[PDB]
Amino acid sequence: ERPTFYRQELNKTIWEVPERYQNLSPVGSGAYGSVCAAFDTKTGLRVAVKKLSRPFQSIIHAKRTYRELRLLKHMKHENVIGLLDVFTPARSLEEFNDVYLVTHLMGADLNNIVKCQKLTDDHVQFLIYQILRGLKYIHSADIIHRDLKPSNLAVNEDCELKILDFGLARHTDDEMTGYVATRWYRAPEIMLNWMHYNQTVDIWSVGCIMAELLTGRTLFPGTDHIDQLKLILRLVGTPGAELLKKISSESARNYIQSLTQMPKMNFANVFIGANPLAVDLLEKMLVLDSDKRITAAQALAHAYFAQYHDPDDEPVADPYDQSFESRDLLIDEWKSLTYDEVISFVPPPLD
């Protein structure tokens, strides 16, 4: 049953993959992984193959490897990345040291859609509807994306959208410093660590994306974390009594009350010419208090998407057991858990 593997050096990386994968070519890499494009001769699909970099070098890395595979094996939704294959060249656990993941090849993301074409209200309707439909699914499994930005959304020529995560390196202080797309879509409560965050972090990110599809421009292109907070508060208004109380960071909470109070602005006078229903939806997404933000499920029932809403084709996820996240284990334990998931993978219906 075990395929035959062949070797190849590509940018100083030894790729050992099954013979089904041909025409391997580097797309990109980082600390957590290397990615190639290839052609899958079994399914006939252009695919991305990610080779994980030192997946078991520490506890943190091992747990991270296990986490991603558990996530990917669970996600089965039209608007969310599907796992086509996972494999390792190793014939046993003793020699299990490499993991490769395969999915459908992107190419075009929402970033290049927004820069290099005219988007109509009906295109915006369709693209945000598909982000929220994917999001209803993943939130239903208590999965939080936390890094939704236009580079993590794949968009094909028919305007069909998938949510993925193309993060190949760590989410460090330096990667979030300055004038960077890395921070522009983050809910303020996670950007400044105000509190224990909830899944409505992702809804904040949708609002910033929806706004950018409407105007063609970044909503909050802060030059640093504080400049970004100023851009945000200028639009949505400074916190009132109720929200401040909920900010457990005494340090965060005292910086806020130094700011001069500002009202929420008129969104119709920022988003000029836009569908009044878009503006309405945006006002419900872009709300400082995460408790009061619209959820994906609620947002799908909004008038703005009447053209597309179908309550019988907006599925929820099967229960997802995340108890491992509380679990403390050894590198070797995380590794064998990971091995069991590799060996147990069943590919999706062909094709």
Ligand SMILES: O=C(Nc1ccc2ccn(CCc3ccncc3)c2c1)c1cc(F)cc(N2CCOCC2)c1
């Ligand atoms: O996208 C993820 N992983 C992944 C798996 C396989 C491949 C192959 C290539 N890449 C890089 C991205 C890419 C894909 C296709 N074509 C070009 C590039 C992979 C990345 C991924 C990982 C996660 F930990 C969470 C989510 N989320 C969690 C929350 O819900 C959404 C899914 C997605």
